[PDB]
Amino acid sequence: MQAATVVINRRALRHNLQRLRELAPASKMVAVVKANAYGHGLLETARTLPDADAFGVARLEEALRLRAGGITKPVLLLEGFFDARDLPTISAQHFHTAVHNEEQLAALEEASLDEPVTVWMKLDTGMHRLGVRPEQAEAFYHRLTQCKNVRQPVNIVSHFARADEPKCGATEKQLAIFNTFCEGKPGQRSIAASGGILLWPQSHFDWVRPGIILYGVSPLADRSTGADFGCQPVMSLTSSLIAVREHKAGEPVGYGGTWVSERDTRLGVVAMGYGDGYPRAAPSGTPVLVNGREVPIVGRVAMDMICVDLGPQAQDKAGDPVILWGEGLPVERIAEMTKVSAYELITRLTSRVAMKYVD
Amino acid sequence: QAATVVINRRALRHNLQRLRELAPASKMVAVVKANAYGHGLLETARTLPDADAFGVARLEEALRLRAGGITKPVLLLEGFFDARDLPTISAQHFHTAVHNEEQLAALEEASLDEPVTVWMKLDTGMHRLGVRPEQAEAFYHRLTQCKNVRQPVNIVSHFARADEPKCGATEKQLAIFNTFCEGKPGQRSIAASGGILLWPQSHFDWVRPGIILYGVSPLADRSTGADFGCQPVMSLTSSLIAVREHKAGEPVGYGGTWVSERDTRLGVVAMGYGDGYPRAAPSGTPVLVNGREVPIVGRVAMDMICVDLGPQAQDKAGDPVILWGEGLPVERIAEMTKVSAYELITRLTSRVAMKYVD
Ligand SMILES: *Cc1c(COP(=O)(O)O)cnc(C)c1O
Ligand SMILES: *Cc1c(COP(=O)(O)O)cnc(C)c1O
């Protein structure tokens, strides 16, 4: 049998890259594949995409696994290097690197590398997470232009904190700061990720960094899916029923007796739980497809099972196909229901689920 | 240097035996399903050669144990999902639960080189898996007539509200489990972590410690493992990748969600929900930077968490961070975030590096 499994549609990956090239026609693409490619598989997502102009990661650990798998494209270390000793590996492997502190800068100033590196000076434009603050960037930037160990020109990168909230002037204030600093300077400019791409065409610049939207899921703080932008659900979280049992009115199902039935019915048990990555927070009523027909979750979601209400004479039975989200059921619909972010839903999965790749 | 789960092997064996002291007349089924609750399926098994069996959710998982060289009986807590799977289960000497018609009919007509040991799963109130009572003495009788089943047929069940001693769920559930097992040979087992600690009349022949085995309390009452003499096994650790200046009135994070009322210094941790850390963590949650507790400030993110260090603080990129672990029980983090400790330690991704000490 099949319990739990993530089916990855390679043909949809393929298409949202293109579809994103159509939305940001004058910008190069940095396919963001950090965190095991948002739960879709780091190496397999990269291999699905010989077209990305580059690949973005969080950590080096992650870039090095690309290389190990045979991926040859430029890989962008979005957060940089964490230790000055990895700078020889960086230049060897031809990684590009963000530089946000004076430890990473100082480390490039002094290191003796065989080849210079390509760098992006992270500028803090309003997120206040990583990056050099404005009042500090002009001097930091100038030191990078004088490194013989950095490739000229120095590129400039930044990130939006609230691009999915078009009504607050957040984004437009970051853009103002970004534009002021990049005035008169060569080399290139990122600042846009999924939101900036979809919603702010004035912050496409030279390179855009699609992450969540790449996978056909939406960045947005509302009920838009990837299909709202012509982008196609990459992932399908699937499993199977391992039991179909009789149940009676007034009887609770499961831990804490969270749900009590008002009628005699039949309950289905799914080989899926939080030990696989399915949200334990999922409330009774959350939709799940059993044989393609929606049924509600009844009870607490356990570590490796989920109960659903099939009906008093349903004909489903152990072994039948279950879809937690995918074709027929977006992850955005499971996010609105659960109250969990689609970003977390597709990404915080464990190693217990099998990975399948299709097309 | 970064996201890492440190597993204390010493605390793990302290707990198994702590638990044999609490349930002195019962044999131990070390529950290691879901990658041993975060901790590592096979390495948790190899740390406990002593325990009397291992429990898993799926057959996949049992097979992975045999592949690593583990040889204690393994108990398939949910049984087998396909009949073509009886032959493997028989040869590999996996013990199984039997809760439905399909599984029983499979046992009835398989041909097998050896008989398989079985635990009939009885639904005593949880209404999740198991044969209902009106229906169980037949189910039962058919299993004792299998020559494919090693006699006697054992009986297993599970509590749905053992952590709520004030409601009569458990004692309703035990009443049923006891009426059915009247007069029948073969082992009995119904207790997991909660039943073991709060209900000694429920220990019977075998108890199945799961969460407590890892030194974490199963009650959402604010107690720890230590509260039962059990030592925490897991420490979710990482490092700071930046220490930056920040000013009063400035926000931080997705949705500028925390705004500072002072000039301070923020630390950035190489930890996010892409690692398994709850995105739901509110500003406030405790982190330990440099063995000193600091609050999370801002939304948590795929790969970085910001903390408030202080205007003048001398923490430095590179420095050690503990999400939970020694200075910081996972139960404290569960109270501050409203997640279950069960989910916190288990729903981690594959990006966590695993360390084993002692
Ligand atoms: C992860 C990340 C991205 C992608 O963002 P999405 O909203 O998922 O598209 C782009 N850039 C940086 C700096 C990131 O850390
Ligand atoms: C997983 C499980 C356990 C162990 O539960 P804890 O609450 O962690 O003690 C024991 N028995 C069964 C039937 C289970 O599914």
mmCIF file of N, CA and C in Angstrom, chain A residues 1 4 34-35 38 58-59 79 82-83 100-101 103 124 127-131 133 159-162 165 242-243 245-248 251-256 267 269 271 274-277 279-280 302-305 307 318 341 343-344 347-350 352, chain B residues 1 3 33-34 37 57-58 61 78 81 99-100 123 126-130 132 158-161 164 241-242 244-247 250-256 266 268 270 273-276 278-279 301-304 306 317 340 342-343 346-349 351:
data_model
loop_
_atom_site.group_PDB
_atom_site.id
_atom_site.type_symbol
_atom_site.label_atom_id
_atom_site.label_comp_id
_atom_site.label_asym_id
_atom_site.label_seq_id
_atom_site.Cartn_x
_atom_site.Cartn_y
_atom_site.Cartn_z
ATOM 1 N N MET A 1 0.830 -1.244 0.000
ATOM 2 C CA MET A 1 0.000 0.000 0.000
ATOM 3 C C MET A 1 0.855 1.282 0.000
ATOM 4 N N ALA A 4 2.141 7.567 3.135
ATOM 5 C CA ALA A 4 2.167 9.001 2.928
ATOM 6 C C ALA A 4 3.174 9.318 1.864
ATOM 7 N N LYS A 34 15.560 26.804 -1.089
ATOM 8 C CA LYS A 34 15.983 26.575 0.283
ATOM 9 C C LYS A 34 14.953 25.716 0.999
ATOM 10 N N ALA A 35 15.354 25.132 2.128
ATOM 11 C CA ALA A 35 14.504 24.260 2.937
ATOM 12 C C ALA A 35 13.961 23.073 2.125
ATOM 13 N N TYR A 38 11.315 24.030 -0.480
ATOM 14 C CA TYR A 38 9.988 24.249 0.067
ATOM 15 C C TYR A 38 9.218 22.953 0.236
ATOM 16 N N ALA A 58 19.629 29.110 1.629
ATOM 17 C CA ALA A 58 19.770 29.749 2.916
ATOM 18 C C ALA A 58 21.182 29.576 3.395
ATOM 19 N N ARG A 59 21.584 28.330 3.378
ATOM 20 C CA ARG A 59 22.777 27.899 4.009
ATOM 21 C C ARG A 59 23.689 27.344 2.965
ATOM 22 N N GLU A 79 21.975 34.219 2.692
ATOM 23 C CA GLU A 79 22.342 34.724 4.022
ATOM 24 C C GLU A 79 23.857 34.859 4.153
ATOM 25 N N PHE A 82 28.999 31.749 7.184
ATOM 26 C CA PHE A 82 28.834 31.884 8.601
ATOM 27 C C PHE A 82 30.188 31.835 9.255
ATOM 28 N N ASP A 83 31.174 31.486 8.463
ATOM 29 C CA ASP A 83 32.496 31.301 8.972
ATOM 30 C C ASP A 83 33.414 31.610 7.853
ATOM 31 N N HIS A 100 26.413 40.749 4.598
ATOM 32 C CA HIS A 100 25.631 41.641 5.443
ATOM 33 C C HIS A 100 26.307 42.145 6.712
ATOM 34 N N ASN A 101 27.427 41.549 7.071
ATOM 35 C CA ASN A 101 28.174 42.041 8.194
ATOM 36 C C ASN A 101 29.635 42.357 8.046
ATOM 37 N N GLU A 103 32.311 41.046 9.103
ATOM 38 C CA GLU A 103 32.919 39.890 9.687
ATOM 39 C C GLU A 103 33.078 39.075 8.452
ATOM 40 N N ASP A 124 19.678 46.528 4.321
ATOM 41 C CA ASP A 124 18.464 46.498 5.134
ATOM 42 C C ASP A 124 17.666 47.749 4.751
ATOM 43 N N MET A 127 13.102 45.626 6.516
ATOM 44 C CA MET A 127 12.779 44.361 7.163
ATOM 45 C C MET A 127 13.442 44.223 8.536
ATOM 46 N N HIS A 128 14.600 44.848 8.701
ATOM 47 C CA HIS A 128 15.356 44.797 9.944
ATOM 48 C C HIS A 128 15.639 43.358 10.395
ATOM 49 N N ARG A 129 16.030 42.529 9.432
ATOM 50 C CA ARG A 129 16.368 41.141 9.714
ATOM 51 C C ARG A 129 17.870 40.955 9.454
ATOM 52 N N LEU A 130 18.256 40.932 8.189
ATOM 53 C CA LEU A 130 19.665 40.845 7.795
ATOM 54 C C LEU A 130 19.990 42.056 6.892
ATOM 55 N N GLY A 131 21.264 42.405 6.787
ATOM 56 C CA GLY A 131 21.625 43.516 5.935
ATOM 57 C C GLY A 131 22.243 44.698 6.641
ATOM 58 N N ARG A 133 22.578 48.543 7.479
ATOM 59 C CA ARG A 133 21.650 49.660 7.588
ATOM 60 C C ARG A 133 22.121 50.816 6.696
ATOM 61 N N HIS A 159 15.303 42.688 0.570
ATOM 62 C CA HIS A 159 14.090 41.875 0.645
ATOM 63 C C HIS A 159 12.926 42.641 1.295
ATOM 64 N N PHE A 160 11.714 42.413 0.784
ATOM 65 C CA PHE A 160 10.488 43.056 1.281
ATOM 66 C C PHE A 160 9.923 42.371 2.521
ATOM 67 N N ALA A 161 9.409 43.156 3.456
ATOM 68 C CA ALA A 161 8.847 42.610 4.681
ATOM 69 C C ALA A 161 7.327 42.491 4.629
ATOM 70 N N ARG A 162 6.694 43.313 3.793
ATOM 71 C CA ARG A 162 5.235 43.354 3.680
ATOM 72 C C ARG A 162 4.728 43.622 2.266
ATOM 73 N N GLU A 165 0.969 43.205 1.364
ATOM 74 C CA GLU A 165 0.053 44.176 1.974
ATOM 75 C C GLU A 165 0.180 45.464 1.201
ATOM 76 N N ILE A 242 -6.468 3.339 6.012
ATOM 77 C CA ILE A 242 -5.995 2.096 6.584
ATOM 78 C C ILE A 242 -7.116 1.425 7.369
ATOM 79 N N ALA A 243 -8.294 2.046 7.350
ATOM 80 C CA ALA A 243 -9.476 1.519 8.031
ATOM 81 C C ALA A 243 -10.743 2.328 7.772
ATOM 82 N N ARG A 245 -14.427 2.183 9.613
ATOM 83 C CA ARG A 245 -15.126 1.597 10.747
ATOM 84 C C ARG A 245 -16.529 2.165 10.978
ATOM 85 N N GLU A 246 -17.372 1.400 11.669
ATOM 86 C CA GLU A 246 -18.716 1.864 12.020
ATOM 87 C C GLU A 246 -18.552 2.772 13.232
ATOM 88 N N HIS A 247 -19.421 3.763 13.360
ATOM 89 C CA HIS A 247 -19.355 4.683 14.479
ATOM 90 C C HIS A 247 -20.788 5.028 14.840
ATOM 91 N N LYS A 248 -21.045 5.380 16.095
ATOM 92 C CA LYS A 248 -22.411 5.724 16.455
ATOM 93 C C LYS A 248 -22.654 7.086 17.085
ATOM 94 N N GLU A 251 -20.949 9.262 20.149
ATOM 95 C CA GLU A 251 -19.589 8.784 20.392
ATOM 96 C C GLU A 251 -18.514 9.745 19.884
ATOM 97 N N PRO A 252 -17.525 10.007 20.733
ATOM 98 C CA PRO A 252 -16.413 10.859 20.362
ATOM 99 C C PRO A 252 -15.401 10.114 19.524
ATOM 100 N N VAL A 253 -14.548 10.818 18.812
ATOM 101 C CA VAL A 253 -13.471 10.168 18.130
ATOM 102 C C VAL A 253 -12.209 10.862 18.545
ATOM 103 N N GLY A 254 -11.467 10.257 19.452
ATOM 104 C CA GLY A 254 -10.030 10.275 19.352
ATOM 105 C C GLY A 254 -9.522 10.840 20.631
ATOM 106 N N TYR A 255 -8.357 11.498 20.593
ATOM 107 C CA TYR A 255 -7.677 12.081 21.764
ATOM 108 C C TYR A 255 -8.353 13.344 22.252
ATOM 109 N N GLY A 256 -8.622 13.422 23.556
ATOM 110 C CA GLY A 256 -9.356 14.516 24.155
ATOM 111 C C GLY A 256 -10.847 14.518 23.854
ATOM 112 N N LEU A 267 -16.376 5.988 9.807
ATOM 113 C CA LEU A 267 -15.167 6.797 9.889
ATOM 114 C C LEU A 267 -14.032 6.147 9.101
ATOM 115 N N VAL A 269 -9.824 6.085 8.423
ATOM 116 C CA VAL A 269 -8.579 6.433 9.108
ATOM 117 C C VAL A 269 -7.491 6.558 8.032
ATOM 118 N N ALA A 271 -3.518 7.224 6.762
ATOM 119 C CA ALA A 271 -2.135 7.006 7.145
ATOM 120 C C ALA A 271 -1.415 8.349 6.936
ATOM 121 N N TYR A 274 1.029 14.214 12.099
ATOM 122 C CA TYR A 274 1.982 15.300 12.201
ATOM 123 C C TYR A 274 3.390 14.778 12.217
ATOM 124 N N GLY A 275 3.514 13.468 12.308
ATOM 125 C CA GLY A 275 4.808 12.818 12.337
ATOM 126 C C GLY A 275 5.307 12.789 10.911
ATOM 127 N N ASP A 276 4.434 13.213 10.003
ATOM 128 C CA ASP A 276 4.689 13.283 8.564
ATOM 129 C C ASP A 276 4.788 14.745 8.164
ATOM 130 N N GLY A 277 4.226 15.610 8.991
ATOM 131 C CA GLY A 277 4.241 17.026 8.692
ATOM 132 C C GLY A 277 2.858 17.668 8.584
ATOM 133 N N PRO A 279 -0.349 19.403 9.874
ATOM 134 C CA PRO A 279 -0.662 20.189 11.070
ATOM 135 C C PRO A 279 -1.571 19.564 12.119
ATOM 136 N N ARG A 280 -1.047 19.481 13.341
ATOM 137 C CA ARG A 280 -1.776 18.938 14.474
ATOM 138 C C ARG A 280 -2.917 19.891 14.828
ATOM 139 N N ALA A 302 -3.598 13.029 14.960
ATOM 140 C CA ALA A 302 -2.575 12.352 15.758
ATOM 141 C C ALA A 302 -1.241 12.347 15.023
ATOM 142 N N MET A 303 -0.235 11.731 15.641
ATOM 143 C CA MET A 303 1.113 11.669 15.067
ATOM 144 C C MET A 303 1.170 10.894 13.740
ATOM 145 N N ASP A 304 0.407 9.828 13.623
ATOM 146 C CA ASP A 304 0.361 9.136 12.378
ATOM 147 C C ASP A 304 -0.979 8.621 11.922
ATOM 148 N N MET A 305 -2.045 9.225 12.413
ATOM 149 C CA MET A 305 -3.360 9.037 11.815
ATOM 150 C C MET A 305 -4.292 10.244 11.878
ATOM 151 N N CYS A 307 -8.639 10.883 11.273
ATOM 152 C CA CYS A 307 -9.954 10.308 11.053
ATOM 153 C C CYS A 307 -10.826 11.282 10.258
ATOM 154 N N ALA A 318 -10.514 0.495 3.270
ATOM 155 C CA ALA A 318 -9.088 0.530 3.547
ATOM 156 C C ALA A 318 -8.346 0.335 2.218
ATOM 157 N N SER A 341 0.242 28.781 7.683
ATOM 158 C CA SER A 341 0.656 29.463 6.476
ATOM 159 C C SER A 341 0.995 28.445 5.427
ATOM 160 N N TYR A 343 3.152 28.494 3.392
ATOM 161 C CA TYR A 343 4.618 28.404 3.393
ATOM 162 C C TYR A 343 5.080 27.292 4.318
ATOM 163 N N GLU A 344 4.459 27.235 5.496
ATOM 164 C CA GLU A 344 4.797 26.247 6.509
ATOM 165 C C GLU A 344 4.213 24.882 6.175
ATOM 166 N N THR A 347 6.356 23.234 3.527
ATOM 167 C CA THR A 347 7.749 23.109 3.968
ATOM 168 C C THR A 347 8.023 22.282 5.232
ATOM 169 N N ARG A 348 7.209 22.429 6.278
ATOM 170 C CA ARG A 348 7.496 21.680 7.494
ATOM 171 C C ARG A 348 7.015 20.227 7.477
ATOM 172 N N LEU A 349 7.527 19.447 6.531
ATOM 173 C CA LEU A 349 7.191 18.037 6.438
ATOM 174 C C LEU A 349 8.424 17.258 6.895
ATOM 175 N N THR A 350 8.228 16.027 7.314
ATOM 176 C CA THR A 350 9.304 15.230 7.852
ATOM 177 C C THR A 350 9.787 14.279 6.802
ATOM 178 N N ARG A 352 9.403 11.193 6.562
ATOM 179 C CA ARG A 352 8.654 9.954 6.599
ATOM 180 C C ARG A 352 7.840 9.782 5.335
ATOM 181 N N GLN B 1 27.427 23.657 13.587
ATOM 182 C CA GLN B 1 27.432 25.084 13.786
ATOM 183 C C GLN B 1 26.047 25.654 13.734
ATOM 184 N N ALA B 3 21.664 24.395 12.502
ATOM 185 C CA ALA B 3 20.508 23.725 13.044
ATOM 186 C C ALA B 3 20.859 22.292 13.305
ATOM 187 N N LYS B 33 8.087 5.319 16.700
ATOM 188 C CA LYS B 33 7.471 5.709 15.434
ATOM 189 C C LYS B 33 7.788 7.178 15.135
ATOM 190 N N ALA B 34 7.598 7.584 13.881
ATOM 191 C CA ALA B 34 7.872 8.941 13.419
ATOM 192 C C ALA B 34 9.321 9.363 13.701
ATOM 193 N N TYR B 37 10.197 9.997 17.325
ATOM 194 C CA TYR B 37 9.705 11.231 17.850
ATOM 195 C C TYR B 37 10.641 12.365 17.611
ATOM 196 N N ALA B 57 4.612 2.763 13.793
ATOM 197 C CA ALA B 57 3.304 3.034 13.201
ATOM 198 C C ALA B 57 3.114 2.252 11.915
ATOM 199 N N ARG B 58 4.151 2.169 11.147
ATOM 200 C CA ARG B 58 4.050 1.636 9.822
ATOM 201 C C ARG B 58 5.031 0.485 9.614
ATOM 202 N N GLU B 61 8.797 0.852 8.605
ATOM 203 C CA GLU B 61 9.516 1.618 9.604
ATOM 204 C C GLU B 61 10.207 0.591 10.425
ATOM 205 N N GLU B 78 -0.336 -0.398 14.093
ATOM 206 C CA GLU B 78 -1.532 -0.223 13.258
ATOM 207 C C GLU B 78 -1.764 -1.452 12.377
ATOM 208 N N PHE B 81 -1.000 -2.961 6.101
ATOM 209 C CA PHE B 81 -1.960 -2.358 5.190
ATOM 210 C C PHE B 81 -2.240 -3.153 3.932
ATOM 211 N N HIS B 99 -6.900 -5.164 13.458
ATOM 212 C CA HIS B 99 -8.093 -4.393 13.789
ATOM 213 C C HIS B 99 -9.253 -4.483 12.813
ATOM 214 N N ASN B 100 -9.026 -5.034 11.629
ATOM 215 C CA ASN B 100 -10.122 -5.131 10.674
ATOM 216 C C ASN B 100 -10.291 -6.477 9.988
ATOM 217 N N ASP B 123 -11.236 -1.604 20.357
ATOM 218 C CA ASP B 123 -11.655 -0.211 20.497
ATOM 219 C C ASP B 123 -12.440 -0.125 21.804
ATOM 220 N N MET B 126 -11.579 5.089 22.249
ATOM 221 C CA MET B 126 -10.898 6.060 21.398
ATOM 222 C C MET B 126 -11.593 6.248 20.061
ATOM 223 N N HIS B 127 -12.223 5.185 19.567
ATOM 224 C CA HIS B 127 -12.940 5.176 18.294
ATOM 225 C C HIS B 127 -12.040 5.607 17.138
ATOM 226 N N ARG B 128 -10.816 5.099 17.147
ATOM 227 C CA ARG B 128 -9.872 5.388 16.077
ATOM 228 C C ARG B 128 -9.603 4.083 15.306
ATOM 229 N N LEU B 129 -8.867 3.164 15.910
ATOM 230 C CA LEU B 129 -8.612 1.858 15.304
ATOM 231 C C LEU B 129 -9.087 0.790 16.291
ATOM 232 N N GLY B 130 -9.354 -0.411 15.794
ATOM 233 C CA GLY B 130 -9.786 -1.470 16.683
ATOM 234 C C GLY B 130 -11.178 -2.010 16.430
ATOM 235 N N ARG B 132 -14.809 -3.107 17.576
ATOM 236 C CA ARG B 132 -15.745 -2.631 18.578
ATOM 237 C C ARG B 132 -16.176 -3.803 19.443
ATOM 238 N N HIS B 158 -5.802 1.348 23.466
ATOM 239 C CA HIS B 158 -5.150 2.624 23.725
ATOM 240 C C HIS B 158 -6.123 3.636 24.345
ATOM 241 N N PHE B 159 -5.614 4.452 25.267
ATOM 242 C CA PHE B 159 -6.396 5.485 25.948
ATOM 243 C C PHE B 159 -6.531 6.765 25.110
ATOM 244 N N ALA B 160 -7.705 7.386 25.172
ATOM 245 C CA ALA B 160 -7.967 8.606 24.420
ATOM 246 C C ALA B 160 -8.006 9.826 25.334
ATOM 247 N N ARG B 161 -7.966 9.583 26.640
ATOM 248 C CA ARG B 161 -7.998 10.662 27.619
ATOM 249 C C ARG B 161 -7.392 10.224 28.948
ATOM 250 N N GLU B 164 -6.281 13.275 31.445
ATOM 251 C CA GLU B 164 -7.391 14.008 32.066
ATOM 252 C C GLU B 164 -8.003 13.120 33.138
ATOM 253 N N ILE B 241 23.770 34.102 13.343
ATOM 254 C CA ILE B 241 24.443 34.392 12.089
ATOM 255 C C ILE B 241 24.571 35.904 11.893
ATOM 256 N N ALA B 242 24.117 36.666 12.883
ATOM 257 C CA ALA B 242 24.188 38.126 12.858
ATOM 258 C C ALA B 242 23.714 38.788 14.159
ATOM 259 N N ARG B 244 22.883 42.730 15.013
ATOM 260 C CA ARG B 244 22.713 44.031 14.385
ATOM 261 C C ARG B 244 22.138 45.097 15.311
ATOM 262 N N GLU B 245 22.402 46.359 14.982
ATOM 263 C CA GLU B 245 21.863 47.481 15.752
ATOM 264 C C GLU B 245 20.406 47.649 15.297
ATOM 265 N N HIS B 246 19.560 48.126 16.194
ATOM 266 C CA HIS B 246 18.162 48.322 15.883
ATOM 267 C C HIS B 246 17.722 49.564 16.645
ATOM 268 N N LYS B 247 16.721 50.279 16.147
ATOM 269 C CA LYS B 247 16.279 51.452 16.869
ATOM 270 C C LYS B 247 14.809 51.516 17.244
ATOM 271 N N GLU B 250 11.206 50.920 15.320
ATOM 272 C CA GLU B 250 11.432 50.077 14.146
ATOM 273 C C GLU B 250 10.909 48.654 14.309
ATOM 274 N N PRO B 251 10.255 48.152 13.282
ATOM 275 C CA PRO B 251 9.755 46.797 13.318
ATOM 276 C C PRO B 251 10.790 45.849 12.827
ATOM 277 N N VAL B 252 10.375 44.624 12.602
ATOM 278 C CA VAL B 252 11.279 43.540 12.379
ATOM 279 C C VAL B 252 10.400 42.409 11.922
ATOM 280 N N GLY B 253 10.688 41.879 10.747
ATOM 281 C CA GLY B 253 10.110 40.616 10.350
ATOM 282 C C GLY B 253 9.066 40.745 9.282
ATOM 283 N N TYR B 254 8.447 39.635 8.944
ATOM 284 C CA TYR B 254 7.336 39.659 8.036
ATOM 285 C C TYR B 254 6.130 40.303 8.677
ATOM 286 N N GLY B 255 5.718 41.420 8.113
ATOM 287 C CA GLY B 255 4.561 42.124 8.592
ATOM 288 C C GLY B 255 4.905 43.055 9.719
ATOM 289 N N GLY B 256 6.144 43.499 9.792
ATOM 290 C CA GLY B 256 6.530 44.354 10.886
ATOM 291 C C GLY B 256 5.592 44.169 12.045
ATOM 292 N N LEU B 266 19.724 43.212 17.846
ATOM 293 C CA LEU B 266 18.990 42.009 17.488
ATOM 294 C C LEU B 266 19.937 40.894 17.046
ATOM 295 N N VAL B 268 20.233 37.164 15.031
ATOM 296 C CA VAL B 268 19.533 36.373 14.020
ATOM 297 C C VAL B 268 20.022 34.928 14.156
ATOM 298 N N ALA B 270 20.092 30.854 13.042
ATOM 299 C CA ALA B 270 20.007 29.975 11.888
ATOM 300 C C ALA B 270 19.010 28.865 12.255
ATOM 301 N N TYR B 273 11.097 27.551 10.427
ATOM 302 C CA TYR B 273 10.165 26.424 10.280
ATOM 303 C C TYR B 273 10.555 25.466 9.131
ATOM 304 N N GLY B 274 11.573 25.851 8.355
ATOM 305 C CA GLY B 274 12.057 25.006 7.283
ATOM 306 C C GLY B 274 12.894 23.915 7.926
ATOM 307 N N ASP B 275 13.095 24.063 9.231
ATOM 308 C CA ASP B 275 13.864 23.136 10.066
ATOM 309 C C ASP B 275 12.910 22.390 10.986
ATOM 310 N N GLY B 276 11.739 22.979 11.184
ATOM 311 C CA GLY B 276 10.757 22.381 12.058
ATOM 312 C C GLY B 276 10.343 23.264 13.221
ATOM 313 N N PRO B 278 8.273 25.954 15.072
ATOM 314 C CA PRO B 278 6.947 26.537 14.841
ATOM 315 C C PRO B 278 6.877 27.978 14.379
ATOM 316 N N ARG B 279 6.238 28.178 13.236
ATOM 317 C CA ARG B 279 6.050 29.497 12.662
ATOM 318 C C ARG B 279 5.104 30.280 13.565
ATOM 319 N N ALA B 301 10.583 32.517 10.666
ATOM 320 C CA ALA B 301 10.698 32.310 9.224
ATOM 321 C C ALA B 301 11.475 31.090 8.754
ATOM 322 N N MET B 302 11.375 30.805 7.475
ATOM 323 C CA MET B 302 11.788 29.514 6.961
ATOM 324 C C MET B 302 13.092 29.035 7.449
ATOM 325 N N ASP B 303 13.983 29.986 7.698
ATOM 326 C CA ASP B 303 15.374 29.754 8.070
ATOM 327 C C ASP B 303 16.047 30.755 9.015
ATOM 328 N N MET B 304 15.319 31.737 9.525
ATOM 329 C CA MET B 304 15.821 32.667 10.532
ATOM 330 C C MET B 304 14.818 33.253 11.510
ATOM 331 N N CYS B 306 14.653 36.080 14.810
ATOM 332 C CA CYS B 306 15.291 37.230 15.433
ATOM 333 C C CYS B 306 14.991 37.245 16.924
ATOM 334 N N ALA B 317 27.760 37.011 16.327
ATOM 335 C CA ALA B 317 27.644 35.977 15.339
ATOM 336 C C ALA B 317 28.557 34.857 15.732
ATOM 337 N N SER B 340 1.876 21.299 20.792
ATOM 338 C CA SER B 340 1.983 20.192 21.678
ATOM 339 C C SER B 340 3.419 19.870 21.656
ATOM 340 N N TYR B 342 4.500 17.073 21.733
ATOM 341 C CA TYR B 342 4.523 15.910 20.831
ATOM 342 C C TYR B 342 4.876 16.346 19.419
ATOM 343 N N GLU B 343 4.265 17.444 18.986
ATOM 344 C CA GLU B 343 4.473 17.981 17.650
ATOM 345 C C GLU B 343 5.799 18.716 17.535
ATOM 346 N N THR B 346 8.612 16.197 17.225
ATOM 347 C CA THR B 346 8.428 15.307 16.083
ATOM 348 C C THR B 346 8.349 15.957 14.697
ATOM 349 N N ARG B 347 7.666 17.095 14.558
ATOM 350 C CA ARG B 347 7.552 17.675 13.227
ATOM 351 C C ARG B 347 8.753 18.537 12.805
ATOM 352 N N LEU B 348 9.923 17.914 12.728
ATOM 353 C CA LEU B 348 11.144 18.585 12.300
ATOM 354 C C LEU B 348 11.486 18.044 10.914
ATOM 355 N N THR B 349 12.139 18.848 10.112
ATOM 356 C CA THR B 349 12.476 18.450 8.780
ATOM 357 C C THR B 349 13.847 17.895 8.725
ATOM 358 N N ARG B 351 16.598 18.691 7.787
ATOM 359 C CA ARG B 351 17.620 19.681 7.549
ATOM 360 C C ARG B 351 18.372 19.969 8.816
#
